[PDB]
């Protein structure tokens, strides 16, 4: 449910605090939370919404020029003057012509030419300011027990399927309680001004494109630029570079415009989100964010329910995730009414002991009528087990077989740890984070070791990381002195921030 | 413009070769059309300007 | 949650039509439509399809170069230009909807009441 | 393209008779499967999706089954009002999507 497919998704296991998980959330993947005796709750970021963005320093990115005009004077007089120098709307440039004896003026050096054309822009791309307030989050959540697999990507009332909700969460309101009809509710802590940097990322928009850019990218560009409310008669700063003042063999002048501009753009975006936008409000789909899940109104409805015996039909077959679990779907025969459902990853025919363990918290069909569908998942062990599901003498047994043994899951859990930890900075120690002191010792370290190194690197993208860390670990192969490691261990940040991404 | 036979044999956008009689196949179908991907379920298709 | 078609009426072979599908009741962009015709005395034929977003649209090879589908979420309209209509194409055409979270696929659906498109002959 | 074959062509039952339909598919659809009702005048009508699971309001009467590739469902007590046509459709993994030739439930 939410989870089932993602493949981007980690399990949260337990709360050694007794009542909160901390979490964060992504807009990539899904977290499903396991507690002791509670219930899996699968939760996931879905759109991160901006609202009311103020339009700052709107550029223009193709020009189009107007009717030209010049005027020339003696080699020793002033210099030339159109009156249309008295005009904001004209670019004029000034140089100097060979004049004399043909041209009309007895003296023979360099005279002076000032040429002027009117400048006009059709289209210009236009960046907004975005504060860290007044931007919502919306957060998807999902519980296990009694859904049939049709539900796992159908979005059509949450209102009252009793089984999912919908938490809106803004600065003004950081925190929520997700009320789930019979489970309780689920209490919902997060920060939402600190999710993602939402203090340097204007909002940019060429012709109905829109992207995240940076500040310090919006402001080093080399294009003709308002300067906020385009009013009245539209004024450019520079019209400096989107017109070109060439001159002939010293006996002219000529000006054009270069051409549009907007490919040059696009290649100078790189590394810059990609982002949507419905009426005045933009919709960004890769995002940041921390949660602490108060999971203490949390109960089990299947509590106190007499198991049902009638009978269990495979629906659709036992099937594998990507990350070793089994989900399930049964069809309920004998209708008996709100009851418990008996499944196991059971070993031994006779002393049927539960091994390994069930992720679907306690499977309880609740609709009674002839038969019922439901999904459960499972994390079976790694050698060969049964998918037992049923009470006496109807029990459909199942042989499962899965393939990895513990070392290649520990590999696995470290990989996406690294790859968390490259893509979050400091906040990866946050993900499981029940909280001690170890885990704040190493999120201190991290925030200081990530500080230093942001300043010194981090302005280089790829291939300037590849370099510079293949220099200095030669650097340090051959250096000999005590500096040794810090060269080394400086590249291993460097080299899988180049090879994890 | 006048142009040196070399810069204009390492450009990296769609080329036909030769006059054209109708509508013109161009060979290479990228590095002007960008197929960008979703969050792992869906495929989008742009143009650069 | 309703959807209300028109457009329908006689035409010439060789002739061109438009067909149009208001929505009503629902987030019409969170919904794949989908034209399905019946020809008289014929089954259920599903013919075109188009995502809740317009990105992709799929045809049928009974209709697939002739017709045309086409959504406007603002003006919550699914239309189905279809030009170059022949004699084989006289039915009734019923538009749906599926809230879809993936590029055509729906689980309930909403029918509207069909629109009768006649080949002169 | 993949094919829906339903059996009978046309069925004749009395008022209350039990009615059975079978959808069989060329290839394996493993749970998706969807039975409509379509009466002379009126809008198709979803009646069962994912092979056993009702749409919202139909009764409980209409049930469906899946076994491999053969699709039943079944009228246990038939009303006057169900007696028209009905179709299965394949809602497998691409739109390539194929109704059935339709069965007529007649009053014999």
């Known amino acids: 449910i939410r989870c089932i497919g993602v493949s981007n998704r980690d399990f949260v296991e337990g709360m050694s605090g007794g009542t909160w998980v901390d979490v964060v959330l992504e807009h990539g993947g899904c977290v499903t939370v396991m507690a002791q005796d509670k219930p899996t709750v699968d939760i996931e970021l879905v759109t991160t919404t901006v609202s009311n963005m103020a339009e700052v320093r709107s550029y223009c990115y193709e020009a189009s020029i107007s009717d030209m005009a010049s005027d020339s004077r003696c080699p020793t007089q002033g210099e030339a003057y159109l009156d249309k120098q008295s005009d904001t709307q004209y670019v004029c440039k000034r140089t100097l012509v060979d004049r004399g004896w043909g041209n009309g003026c007895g003296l023979f050096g360099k005279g002076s030419l000032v040429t002027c054309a009117k400048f006009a822009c059709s289209k210009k791309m236009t960046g907004k300011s975005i504060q860290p307030e007044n931007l919502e989050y919306r957060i998807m959540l999902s519980v296990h027990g009694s859904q049939h697999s049709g539900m796992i990507v159908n979005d059509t009332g949450h209102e009252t399927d009793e089984n999912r909700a919908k938490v809106e969460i803004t600065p003004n309101s950081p925190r929520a309680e997700a009320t789930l009809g019979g489970f309780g509710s689920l209490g919902l802590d997060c920060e939402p001004r600190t999710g993602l940097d939402f203090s340097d990322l204007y909002y940019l928009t060429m012709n109905n494109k829109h992207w995240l850019v940076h500040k310090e990218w919006f402001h080093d560009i080399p294009l003709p630029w308002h300067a906020g409310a385009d009013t009245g008669t539209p004024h450019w700063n520079n019209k400096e570079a989107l017109v070109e003042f060439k001159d002939a063999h010293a006996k002219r002048q000529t000006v054009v415009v270069l051409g549009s501009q907007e490919g040059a753009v696009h290649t100078a975006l790189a590394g810059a989100l990609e982002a949507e936008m419905d009426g005045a409000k933009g919709r960004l789909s890769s995002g940041h964010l921390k949660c602490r899940l108060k999971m203490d109104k949390l109960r089990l409805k299947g509590v106190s329910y007499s198991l049902c015996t009638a009978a269990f039909t495979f629906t659709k077959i036992p099937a594998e995730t990507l990350h070793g679990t089994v989900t399930v779907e049964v069809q309920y025969a004998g209708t008996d009414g709100p009851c418990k459902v008996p499944a196991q990853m059971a070993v031994d025919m006779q002393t049927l002991t539960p091994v390994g363990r069930l992720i679907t918290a306690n499977p309880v069909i609740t609709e009674s009528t002839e038969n019922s569908k439901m999904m459960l998942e499972l994390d079976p062990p790694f050698g060969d087990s049964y998918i037992v599901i049923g009470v006496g003498e109807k029990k459909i047994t199942h042989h499962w077989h899965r393939s990895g043994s513990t070392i290649g899951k520990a590999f696995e859990a470290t990989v996406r740890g690294a790859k968390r930890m490259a893509v979050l900075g400091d906040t990866a120690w946050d993900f499981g984070s029940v909280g001690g002191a170890l885990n704040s010792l190493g999120k201190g370290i991290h925030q200081i070791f990530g500080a230093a190194f942001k300043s010194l690197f981090g302005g280089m993208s790829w291939f300037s990381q590849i370099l510079i860390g293949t220099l200095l670990m030669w650097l340090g192969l051959n250096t000999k002195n005590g500096s040794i490691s810090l060269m080394c261990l400086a590249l291993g940040g460097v080299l899988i921030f180049l090879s994890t991404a | 413009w006048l142009v040196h036979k070399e810069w204009f044999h390492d450009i990296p956008l769609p080329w036909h070769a030769g006059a054209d009689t109708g509508t013109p196949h161009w060979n290479n179908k990228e590095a002007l059309v960008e197929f960008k991907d979703a969050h792992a379920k869906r495929q989008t298709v742009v143009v650069l300007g | 949650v309703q959807l209300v078609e028109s457009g329908g009426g006689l035409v010439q072979p060789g002739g061109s039509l438009r067909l149009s599908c208001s929505a009503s009741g629902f987030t019409f962009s969170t919904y794949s439509m989908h034209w399905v015709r019946q020809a008289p005395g014929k089954g259920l034929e599903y013919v075109s399809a188009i995502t809740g977003e317009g990105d992709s649209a799929f045809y049928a090879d009974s209709v697939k170069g002739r017709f045309t589908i086409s959504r406007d979420n603002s003006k919550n309209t699914l239309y189905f230009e279809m030009n170059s209509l022949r004699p084989e194409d006289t039915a009734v055409y019923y538009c749906?909807?599926?809230?879809?979270?993936?590029?055509?696929?729906?689980?309930?659906?909403?029918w509207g009441q069909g629109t009768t498109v006649t080949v002169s002959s | 393209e993949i094919v829906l074959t339903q059996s009978p062509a046309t069925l004749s039952l009395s008022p209350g008779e039990r009615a059975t339909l079978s959808c069989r598919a060329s290839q394996s659809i493993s749970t998706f499967l969807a039975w409509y009702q379509h009466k002379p005048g009126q809008a198709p009508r979803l009646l069962i999706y994912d092979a056993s699971t009702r749409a919202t309001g139909v009764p409980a009467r209409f049930s469906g089954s899946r076994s491999g590739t053969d699709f039943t469902l079944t009228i246990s007590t038939l009303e006057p009002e169900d007696f028209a046509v009905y179709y299965c459709?394949?809602?497998?993994?691409?739109?390539?999507?194929?109704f059935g030739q339709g069965t007529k439930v007649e009053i014999k």
């Open positions: 459709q394949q809602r497998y993994n691409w739109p390539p999507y194929t």
């Open positions: 749906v909807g599926g809230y879809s979270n993936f590029y055509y696929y729906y689980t309930m659906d909403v």
